[PDB]
């Protein structure tokens, strides 16, 4: 019987590699632009440490495609199933918690001073962003212990002559637990951002959060449905594609629009401008 | 002697589906009646005038396809099922897209373009654009009927003591051919209405269209895993249900909330609240 896995001989595989290259180089452009604008008003609103780390995690994540392609080994199953999902969840949680932070902010001080008086100082929403993160770990790492690590194989029935090699035992059940919290976060951020799509806050970042979260939600729902309908060879390529596109959505859809103001509206770069967005 | 098997009209699932047809089609007829009641009212005019009534009419002809699915199969019935469902559906959804287009021209497009383009969309051109969308759908339906028709299957051993009769679709592609036009209209409508925001003191049009598109997508997406899981004999029931629920999703988010204002809050039916 014949082994099957992604290889560069395949037009869509190299196409995903090229798309990931475009994404990584564009995100590198984003970061090197931010690198000489550390304390500008728009970068200052970005979140400070949060934006640098998020960008950095994403810059790493794009390497998945070269590591995902080719004859599998456990060395690749380690990252594609646990590490890169961690890199992605850190970013999704950051976006969603920022969306919550922006909206409903007015009610925090006046109605809940008992909370806000301490929640404002020194960490605030960071704490929740941390806890969600470890919660995902409880899903991920222990889950990998349950399935164990292996580049397993399965058969495609249209002709059982050929066999898929993949780092994902029980793919649908494996992905269900992973995607439950992804859907929860995506829908929560989508709701908060859409309700707040009018707000000018932080150079009107709610609209871009809305765009990115909508893309993530639609793509996740689509892939879960498609996997519930299909189990053949193509699952791995599409799954990779959906991943890379999602990365693009996070990079170009959220930081891209801010960078689109950085260099092109030096008027809005002015420090005195910011008070008009209160 | 094996019994032939197909959905009997009296089965409780078919009874429930034809019951739901009562709610869907009766509400469609009631909304059309209310539109006839306040036909000249600016509200119907702001809602595109007669294109609104035509749309409702088309929606009924969409629900009218539900009757083709159950009962003793035939090749003609299998051929007719999909196109006679989705063609009326296109005749309806093109108008939702048109109103979404109107909201985009109003509240994101600069005035210099918008003042002309808003007048250019409306008039005879709106009717002819609906006709053009129906023409696209009809071309795709002709390609489907000739090159990728479904086949009547009588299967002799898939069951212990019965022979299973039903239409079977050649490839998911052949059905995708019929779902492309409506899917495309929905994508355009959502992208047109999603990001726009209105001033206060004016009618909130984009919200209803957004909810309509989301209901459409969610219905036809949930329809996939269920159709994959359901027994072979009962595939039609989830098709019919989708057609019903999909129609309901369009009704309850766009038309019915307008009839709600028409009947229970008529003070809003005033010129500058819409214009």
Curated annotation (Swiss-Prot), chain A:
<feature type="topological domain" description="Extracellular">
    <location>
        <begin position="229"/>
        <end position="231"/>
    </location>
</feature>
<comment type="similarity">
    <text>Belongs to the G-protein coupled receptor 3 family. TAS1R subfamily.</text>
</comment>
<feature type="topological domain" description="Cytoplasmic">
    <location>
        <begin position="253"/>
        <end position="278"/>
    </location>
</feature>
<feature type="topological domain" description="Extracellular">
    <location>
        <begin position="150"/>
        <end position="174"/>
    </location>
</feature>
<feature type="transmembrane region" description="Helical; Name=2">
    <location>
        <begin position="50"/>
        <end position="70"/>
    </location>
</feature>
<comment type="function">
    <text>Putative taste receptor. TAS1R2/TAS1R3 recognizes diverse natural and synthetic sweeteners.</text>
</comment>
<feature type="transmembrane region" description="Helical; Name=7">
    <location>
        <begin position="232"/>
        <end position="252"/>
    </location>
</feature>
<feature type="topological domain" description="Cytoplasmic">
    <location>
        <begin position="35"/>
        <end position="49"/>
    </location>
</feature>
<feature type="topological domain" description="Extracellular">
    <location>
        <begin position="71"/>
        <end position="82"/>
    </location>
</feature>
<feature type="transmembrane region" description="Helical; Name=1">
    <location>
        <begin position="14"/>
        <end position="34"/>
    </location>
</feature>
<feature type="transmembrane region" description="Helical; Name=6">
    <location>
        <begin position="208"/>
        <end position="228"/>
    </location>
</feature>
<feature type="topological domain" description="Cytoplasmic">
    <location>
        <begin position="104"/>
        <end position="128"/>
    </location>
</feature>
<protein>
    <recommendedName>
        <fullName>Taste receptor type 1 member 2</fullName>
    </recommendedName>
</protein>
<feature type="topological domain" description="Cytoplasmic">
    <location>
        <begin position="196"/>
        <end position="207"/>
    </location>
</feature>
<feature type="transmembrane region" description="Helical; Name=4">
    <location>
        <begin position="129"/>
        <end position="149"/>
    </location>
</feature>
<feature type="transmembrane region" description="Helical; Name=3">
    <location>
        <begin position="83"/>
        <end position="103"/>
    </location>
</feature>
<comment type="subunit">
    <text>Forms heterodimers with TAS1R3.</text>
</comment>
<feature type="transmembrane region" description="Helical; Name=5">
    <location>
        <begin position="175"/>
        <end position="195"/>
    </location>
</feature>
From Swiss-Prot, chain B:
<feature type="transmembrane region" description="Helical; Name=3">
    <location>
        <begin position="85"/>
        <end position="105"/>
    </location>
</feature>
<feature type="transmembrane region" description="Helical; Name=1">
    <location>
        <begin position="13"/>
        <end position="33"/>
    </location>
</feature>
<comment type="subunit">
    <text>Forms homodimers or heterodimers with TAS1R1 and TAS1R2.</text>
</comment>
<feature type="topological domain" description="Extracellular">
    <location>
        <begin position="72"/>
        <end position="84"/>
    </location>
</feature>
<feature type="transmembrane region" description="Helical; Name=2">
    <location>
        <begin position="51"/>
        <end position="71"/>
    </location>
</feature>
<feature type="topological domain" description="Cytoplasmic">
    <location>
        <begin position="106"/>
        <end position="127"/>
    </location>
</feature>
<feature type="transmembrane region" description="Helical; Name=6">
    <location>
        <begin position="208"/>
        <end position="228"/>
    </location>
</feature>
<feature type="topological domain" description="Cytoplasmic">
    <location>
        <begin position="197"/>
        <end position="207"/>
    </location>
</feature>
<feature type="topological domain" description="Extracellular">
    <location>
        <begin position="229"/>
        <end position="236"/>
    </location>
</feature>
<feature type="transmembrane region" description="Helical; Name=5">
    <location>
        <begin position="176"/>
        <end position="196"/>
    </location>
</feature>
<feature type="transmembrane region" description="Helical; Name=4">
    <location>
        <begin position="128"/>
        <end position="148"/>
    </location>
</feature>
<feature type="transmembrane region" description="Helical; Name=7">
    <location>
        <begin position="237"/>
        <end position="257"/>
    </location>
</feature>
<comment type="similarity">
    <text>Belongs to the G-protein coupled receptor 3 family. TAS1R subfamily.</text>
</comment>
<protein>
    <recommendedName>
        <fullName>Taste receptor type 1 member 3</fullName>
    </recommendedName>
</protein>
<feature type="topological domain" description="Extracellular">
    <location>
        <begin position="149"/>
        <end position="175"/>
    </location>
</feature>
<comment type="function">
    <text>Putative taste receptor. TAS1R1/TAS1R3 responds to the umami taste stimulus (the taste of monosodium glutamate) and also to most of the 20 standard L-amino acids, but not to their D-enantiomers or other compounds. TAS1R2/TAS1R3 recognizes diverse natural and synthetic sweeteners. TAS1R3 is essential for the recognition and response to the disaccharide trehalose. Sequence differences within and between species can significantly influence the selectivity and specificity of taste responses.</text>
</comment>
<feature type="topological domain" description="Cytoplasmic">
    <location>
        <begin position="34"/>
        <end position="50"/>
    </location>
</feature>
